Every structure is written in structure tokens, then in C-alpha cells.
Design a protein around this ligand. Structure first.
Ligand code: A1A4A
Length: 185
């Protein structure tokens, strides 16, 4: 792909984080803690899952960023509406305001309803995410495999400002402690 020149500097929004997440000082890395991280509750925090939003809001234009997923067993990545549900149980779908892919149990899937199987021969260590607001497109790229396409959501109905979306996943297995990291431009 040739989307690199739309690169944006994403930072994580602490206030949106599930209370178990640990965000680095530079707001560019996040991981699952082994306990509640001693923050107050608020209406923005994702309560049921290890999720956090980027601080940036997008309502026009083309945007690109990269995320490091090295040695994780489970994660979700993409974008979502600013007004997605924060509390209780919900599925990641465009109907609920999410445009995401994930790794789960050694398979990759796109968060359509129902979910779509992805075909990845080279397990990615870094994922590229491209958003074209005007066109209604969200695309995912395998940076480990020379930028190969993973998935395109087209005919997207954003219906609001978008925010970068992250889920570090649970660590029930003891094999999923590694962080998500925003990669430098
Ligand atoms: C999302 C809030 C919670 N997350 N933390 C909780 N429990 C856990 O995840 C424990 C058991 C597996 C590893 O740590 S409740």
C-alpha cells in the first residue's frame, strides 16, 4: 500500500481505559495489569473488557497508523464511533459502531455480524490501519508481510466522529501479558 504519508500520531486516552490497564508515560503503549490500577470510575471507562480509545477524533480525511502486536495471543484493533457503549456486554460490529479485526484462539477474524474469517499466511507482528472518512473505508494491512491487505470494510456508515480503538485482551492463559504499542512514524 501507499498510505504511509497519511500517518497520524495517536496517543491513548487514560480516562477511557478499563481500570486494569497500565498506559505508559508517553501514552503510546498499553498492557493488562494483574489487578485494578487504583483509578476512580467514570462514565467513559470500558467496564467489561480490557479496552481503551485513542485521544484523537476524526470527522474527515485520510488517516493511517500502526500497532505492534508482537507475541500476543488475543487482541482487537480498529476504529469506533465516539458514542459507542462503554458499560456491560456488547459485540464488536458496525451496527454497534465498531470497525475492527481480532486475533482469538490462533485465528484472525473481521468484526462483521456475523464475523468473517481472515486468511493470513504470515502471522503479523505489526498491523497498519487506514481510514478514509469520505469514502467510508477502513482497511487493515500486514506490515510483517510487506504491507499485504488483511481486510477492507467498505460502505461504512460511521454516523459520528471516529476514535482509534484497542483491546489488549484478557490474560487467563498467562501467555497474553504483552502490550499493544503504537509504532513510530
Ligand atoms: C475487565 C476487568 C477484569 N479484568 N481482570 C479481571 N480478572 C482477570 O482478568 C484476572 C483473571 C485472569 C487474569 O486476571 S476482572
Amino acid at each position: 500500500h501507499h498510505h504511509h504519508h497519511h500517518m497520524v500520531h495517536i496517543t491513548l486516552d487514560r480516562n477511557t481505559a478499563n481500570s486494569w490497564l497500565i498506559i505508559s508515560k508517553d501514552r503510546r503503549q498499553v498492557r493488562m495489569g494483574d489487578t485494578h490500577q487504583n483509578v476512580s470510575d467514570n462514565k467513559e471507562r470500558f467496564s467489561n473488557y480490557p479496552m481503551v480509545l485513542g485521544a484523537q477524533r476524526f470527522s474527515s480525511g485520510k488517516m493511517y497508523w500502526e500497532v505492534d502486536v508482537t507475541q500476543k495471543e488475543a487482541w482487537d484493533l480498529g476504529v469506533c464511533r465516539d458514542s459507542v457503549q462503554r458499560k456491560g456486554q456488547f459485540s464488536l460490529s458496525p451496527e454497534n459502531g465498531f470497525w475492527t479485526i481480532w486475533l482469538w484462539q490462533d485465528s484472525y477474524e473481521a468484526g462483521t455480524s456475523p464475523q468473517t474469517t481472515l486468511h493470513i499466511q504470515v502471522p503479523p507482528c505489526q498491523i497498519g490501519i487506514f481510514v478514509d472518512y469520505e469514502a467510508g473505508v477502513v482497511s487493515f494491512y500486514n506490515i510483517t508481510d510487506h504491507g499485504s491487505l488483511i481486510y477492507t470494510f467498505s460502505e461504512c456508515v460511521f454516523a459520528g466522529p471516529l476514535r482509534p480503538f484497542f483491546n489488549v485482551g484478557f490474560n487467563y492463559s498467562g501467555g497474553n501479558a504483552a502490550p499493544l504499542k503504537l509504532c513510530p512514524l
